[PDB]
């Protein structure tokens, strides 16, 4: 109950359908006008968000003290909307999970929840040939169209879906300091 329920609350207040020139993605709204996307979505100066065109004030590929690719892009949106601040639900350190749910919301895959099970430490990932770090893995057959999906455990927001090989899926881990 509490876990699936947490995922459903997040969907409504913080998860949005977007489209870039690279296709359809799920977006996590983090706080106020700040959101996060998979880097592969390559957001431009304008993005579609639930059937409206929105100006992008800033977009930054995420960097930290390790100086590694993390497969995420932070964006600040030129919008009236202010996301409820969910940073307190993001752990300070990358966190695995026993019973995670992947929350997907795109125009093609609207408002869906997928129990992916265990989310385990994985680390380095060559993602279609691009070196990527700080990933976690689930033994679930994730699909094209699910990138940006939000990986949650009860009371915690732990990852963003970025890739998979047909049998397993991979997320970029989330840490609170990314959003400081």
Residues at the site binding ligand AG7, with contacts judged by CB under 6 A: 23, 40, 125, 127-128, 130, 142-147, 163-165, 168-170
Name which of 38 and 89 has its Cβ closer to ligand AG7: 38
Residue nearest to ligand AG7 (CB): 164
- Minimum separation from the CB atom of position 44 to ligand AG7 (A): 17
Distance of CA 81 to the CA centre of its chain: 19
Name which of 95 and 132 has its Cβ closer to ligand AG7: 132
Nearest 5 degrees, angle CA 34-CA 39-CA 44?
Answer: 70
- Minimum separation from the CB atom of position 143 to ligand AG7 (A): 6
Name which of 67 and 166 has its Cβ closer to ligand AG7: 166
Show the tokens assigned to 53.
């065109």
Name which of 125 and 174 has its Cβ closer to ligand AG7: 125
- Minimum separation from the CB atom of position 97 to ligand AG7 (A): 17
C-beta separation of 37 from 72 below 8 A? yes
Nearest to 152 by CA among 113, 125, 105, 180: 113
Task: Give the CA-trace dihedral at 125, 129, 130, 135, to 10 degrees.
Answer: -20
């Amino acid at each position: 109950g509490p876990s699936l329920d947490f995922a459903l609350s997040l969907l409504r207040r913080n998860v949005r359908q977007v489209q870039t020139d690279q296709g359809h993605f799920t977006m996590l709204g983090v706080r106020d006008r700040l959101a996060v996307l998979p880097r592969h979505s390559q957001p431009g100066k304008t993005i579609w968000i639930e059937h409206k065109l929105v100006n992008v004030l800033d977009a930054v590929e995420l960097v930290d003290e390790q100086g590694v690719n993390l497969a995420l892009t932070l964006i600040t949106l030129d919008t009236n909307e202010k996301f409820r601040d969910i940073t307190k639900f993001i752990p300070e350190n990358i966190s695995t999970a026993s019973d995670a749910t992947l929350v997907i919301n795109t125009e093609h895959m609207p408002s869906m929840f997928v129990p992916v099970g265990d989310v385990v430490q994985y680390g380095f990932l060559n993602l279609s040939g691009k070196p990527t770090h700080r990933t976690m893995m689930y033994n679930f057959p994730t699909k094209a169209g699910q990138c940006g999906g939000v990986v949650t455990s009860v009371g915690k927001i732990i990852g963003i879906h970025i890739g998979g090989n047909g049998r397993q899926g991979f997320c970029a881990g989330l840490k609170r300091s990314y959003f400081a």
